[PDB]
Structure formats: C-alpha cells, structure tokens
Amino acid sequence: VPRGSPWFGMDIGGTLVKLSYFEPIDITAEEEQEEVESLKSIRKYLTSNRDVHLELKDLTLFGRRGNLHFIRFPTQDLPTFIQMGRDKNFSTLQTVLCATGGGAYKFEKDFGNLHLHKLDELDCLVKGLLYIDSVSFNGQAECYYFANASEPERCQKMPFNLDDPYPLLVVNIGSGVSILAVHSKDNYKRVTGTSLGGGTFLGLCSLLTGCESFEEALEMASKGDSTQADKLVRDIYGGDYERFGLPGWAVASSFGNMIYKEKRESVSKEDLARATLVTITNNIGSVARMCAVNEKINRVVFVGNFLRVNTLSMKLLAYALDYWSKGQLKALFLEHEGYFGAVGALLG
Template sequence: MDTTAEQNGAGPSYANGLQNGFCPAQLSNGSCSSLIASASSSSSGGHSGIDSFHHLHQDLHNNGSPAKKCRLRRRMDSGKKNRPPFPWFGMDIGGTLVKLVYFEPKDITAEEEQEEVENLKSIRKYLTSNTAYGKTGIRDVHLELKNLTMCGRKGHLHFIRFPTQAMHRFIQMGSDKNFSSLHTTLCATGGGAYKFEEDFRTMADLELLKLDELDCLIQGLLYVDSVGFNGHPECYFFENPSDPQNCVKRPCSLDNPFPMLLVNIGSGVSILAVYSKDSYKRVTGTSLGGGTFLGLCCLLTGCETFEEALEMAAKGNSTNVDKLVKDIYGGDYERFGLQGSAVASSFGHMMSKEKRDTISKEDLARATLVTITNNIGSIARMCAVNEKIERVVFVGNFLRINMVSMKLLAYAMDFWSKGQLKALFLEHEVKFALFVVET
C-alpha cells in the first residue's frame, strides 16, 4: 500500500517494544526469542521469554480455563527450549491482498506428535494438504522454501494469499478452528493490521502484534536473499533489456546491497532509499500502483481479477491506444534522444472517435499496464539519480506473474540511464514483510 505521509526519518523504528521488527534481546545476543515468542507471551502481564516462566507456572495452576491451561503449558514447554510454540504464522494485510506465511516443521519427534493437540494437527493438515482454500485462497506451491532451519527447527515455509475482502471469512475460520487456544496473539503488518484489529479481537479472541511494514520489508528482503531460493539465488535481472529478442533472465547476488533504492509496488507505491540494514528513508511514493491498474482495467474492460487483467494485457497492443513520439514527429525526436516508439501521450489516441471504435479491451488493458509501469519507472529513475544510487530493486504484488511490467522497468532503467542503472527483481515479490515475523 502507499504510505501517504512522507516518512523521511531513518529507521529503525521502535514499536511495541520491538526494534526494526525484532525483539531488542534478539538483536543483541542472537537469541531465538522471536516475534512469535513475544506475541505468545504478550498476555501474561507484560512478561516475556525465560523471565516469565514462574508467572506462566503460577497462571497454569490458578486459571481454570482448559484452553488457557493448554496454551500456557505449550508456552512453558517451548520457552524451556528458547523458541515459540507452534503454529508459526505471519501476515501482511494489504489493501488488495492478504499474504500469509506458515512454517511447517518437518522434524517433529514421536513424543511431540503424541503430545500435539488436535486443533494444531488440524491446522497443519489443512494448510499443507491443500493448494486452494475456498474460491479465492491460494497456496503458491512454486514459492515454497524447503528445508530451512528457524529457531533450531527444520521445516518448509508455505506462502498463502487471498483477497483482503475475504478477511472476515478468514477470521471466522480461525475462530471455528479454535486458534485462540494455541496463541493469544498473531504478528501482522500492513494497513489491515490496524483496520481489522478489532475484528480479530471480537470474532476470534485474538490480538494483533502490529509491525511496521517498511521495517519488515527491508529485514525480510535481506533474510530471503541470505537463505536463497531452494539452492538458487533469490535475486535476478534482465540481460539485454533493450533487445526484446535477446532479453533473458539472469540470477544475481545481493552480497553488497547497500545503498539500494527499494521500490515497493502494491496497491500504491512506496520508494525507499536504504543505506544499511538499520538505516533507510522513504523518499516518496505514488498512489498510482497495482490497485490503479486493476481498478481501471475493471472499469475499461469488465475484468474481475488481477490475473484476468494481465491475461488481457498480454494479448493487447498499447500503441493502438497511446500516442507515440513518431505519431507527432513522424519518427525519432533526435535532438533529445527520444525514440519514435516512446510514448508521448498515454491514451492519447482515445481523443479520436475513429480510434476508439477500433480498439479492443485487450488494447485498453495493455495501455493501462504500460501507463502505470512507465510512471513508476520514471519516478524510480528520478529518485535513484537524486539519491545517487545505482541499484534499484523492484518488489511488490503488482509484479506477481507480470513479466510485461518487469521487462518494461528493466528497459526503462537501462535506456534512460545509458546503462548506469540496473533494475533488480526477486522471486518472492511480495512476501518479505512476513519473514521477519518468523525469524
């Protein structure tokens, strides 16, 4: 989402007792007292980690609620091992999509399996045995990260997404599966962590530990790049972006990532100048992002989903809609290095009734995609020049299955900078805000 206020102060931020999305104790001593551990213990009088054991023990004997006794016992057992109890979740509740990550432990012992409560088994089976949940929930199997070690446990990370408009059904499912008997608090980021906070509380008896989405974005990006993508690099770029016939995807490394310009394209756009893992500023943003593309496509073409809009755009020709430099000059504008194929006026041909009568819905979808992408690329390039940064990393759900926009951005960065700026992309386009919740 686009953060409207200009947040020009450098990170990290301190919120809810957390520094840059991690517990301060974890930052200082490498402990596995993760955010989930903080969340799980947040209801026990403000105590956390090992120091809260005697309080948990006292609560276990004094409280008569079976659900709370189960929860407290699991927290005590996990706390002795210096890690949070399962299940491990994280959510990024955006303006258009909810992105959820789930850690599936693969090293469960026979003793642990025997002691597991039924609803924990039920949740794990439900999430890992399905690739679709209802009509709109999807588990992106191709993005699964396998055989990771987190907090001393080995397992897989699963990535699930569903429309934000289905949030109330998700909360109700959590209530139906009695999730509050396992955790009292969930870690969440994004604007929806504020919007739906009361609904989680009243419908599912759950609190949300709200984390700053830009802090999570940066920390998560660095984490996922460090672990890689199942033996392959997470980061990639397009070689020969100015030559469509020879433009190919190439892996690359972010071994020395700083400084970098981080362009987060969700419903809106935020652009960050990142100088180190602990220092960044929000340079600017724009309200014209992925939400704009989908909204306009719905109006212009009657499509219903992002996937449908992209499918239409892939078949369209934007030059039937946009007025190009050559439409005005008859060719290139050589004095200023403008190629005849460059867009001079987005949707400029639509002033002509004759043109309007001949275009297709696919042409309109393609022109909308090109318009939004070109605008983002132009702003990103200007920010990179102003900040004197040569590495530009594009992330966000707008780029999911959107090869057209990625190649347009790569071309724009390369052409207008005369090869000085390189556009980088990542395999997990939108999932970074989630990793910090689990690590």
C-alpha cells in the first residue's frame, strides 16, 4: 500500500510527461474528496492545449476501488504540476518525486528543492504492460492485431486475447530497438536488440528528404513507393526466384536501385522516405521472428514511441512478421501503449 496520496506515476520524456493517476471512488473523508476534485482540475488545466477514452473504470488497486486515468502534457508545465501538488497538500509531491523517462534527470536540474527518485524505463514498461493486460480494457480488448497482414492496404484491426501473455516477447522500438523475453511477472530479460530503429528512420529521412520531424517523415512515407528505390527479386530474375521460392515482389536489396545515377535522379523524396520505413520495418520483423523462434515464444508485442504517430508503421510491422514467420506469428499491439512506463512507475 503506497504511503502518501494521491497515487500517480510519471514518465518524463524530453518533451512530454506521461502521467497515470488513480481516482478512488469509495471516499469517506472530505479531505480526500477535494483531493479528487483537485486532480480533476489539474487534469483539465494540464491537458488544455482519446486519453480520456483510455480510462480504466472501477478497477481495484492496492485494495481500493477506483478509476485509472492517463494524461500527457508538456514537460514545460511539470513545475506547475509540482506546485499544484504542494498547494493542494499532496503528500506524494512532498517527500520525493518518483519517475521514469529520459527527461527525468534533465528535469530535476531545471527544477526550488526536490529530490528525484529515478526508475528504469524498461522495468517500468514491463511491469505496467503486464498489469494493464491483466485488468483488461474495461472488459474489452487491450491487445489487437491486423488480420490479413500480408495486404497492408486491406488489413483490418481485430482484437486478440492475451489472457495469460506468458511467455511474451516485447519489441520496444524507440530511437533504437530492445527485445525482451518475458517469462513471468518477475522473470524477464533483454535478449537482444537492433540499432536500426525509429532514430535511424528519422535520421536517414532528414538527410535524404530534408524533413524536419517524425510527423513529416511518416507523412512523406505514406505517399511514397519504396519499390522505386529498392531492387526487388523480380528486377533480378524477371519474376520469382524459383530455385529458392523467393517471390518476385520480395525486396532483394534495400535502396538497391539507387546505385544507378538515372534511378537516383527520378526517385522522389516520398519514395526514399517510404523505402527508409520499409527497410526498417522489414528488418525489425526479421529480428523479432528469429528471436521468437530462438526463445520458443509465439506471442510478439510491439511497443515504443515509434508507433505513436500513424498506424502505418504498425501495419508494416505486422506485414513483416507475417512474412518472415510465413504466417505463423501475428504482430500484436496494445491500446495503452505510451502509458506503460507511467503505470509501471505508479505500481512501484
């Protein structure tokens, strides 16, 4: 049972803070009632620029019934959150501030007197992810996948039952990629990873197209055709590679056609961006598949800041895993992605 109150957990990023807080519903003390009213006021102010729809209602946490809320706000407003806490007499924002995230340390610097208790991102991620999945999404599906993944322009989002997720392979895609094998609530480890993640995508896009943000890079990619920069098996064999059954549409060499000056001249920014995304997603799908095989795990879930913009990346990842596993593995995703670190921090 957490000492002070109210109960919340935060994931301080370089730009945004992800905060999860618990709203108790069985209240008998006037002081707790206004504590709940203060939290609502705080939420409304901080979010004054979907998350509301992620609210988990009437769940039992630490023996008490309540609603779990999720909000995100600029790290620029974190000092305000802290002061609101002290002004509204929150004992949890008194002692020391617990939190995860990369902007955590940076923040404690800019910030008066305050002692930060830094928690590990991957540890918080795992704990929170497992917890949310255990309490379900208000009885509905917290986990989903894309049926007919082999057809990205036609696949459909469908729920997936992850009752007993164990064992589980968690592929975390941020600037880079960490892959965790989760055997139980307390048994898991980072089995491997790849340096070809979201940072490589944006990094290469910025140099090849001049884009200025992750949002812009993805937008270009959605409009491009990767097969204009990539050399396909068909470009080599004039169709499928019969001998080893490689289909003609399979990518033979990423950016392979960019070795010809002429091809480089006509290739569009949007094409290079989509080719960059396809190279990254197909490679991640391969690493995940081989790791799943080696770990003997058949449930692969993808999380990370890289999946927070468009569903395009998720669909290409589904397409990739389906391809490398010859349809045996399905790429899984979670509705509360982005808030697991926060939830993990709250549990701790």
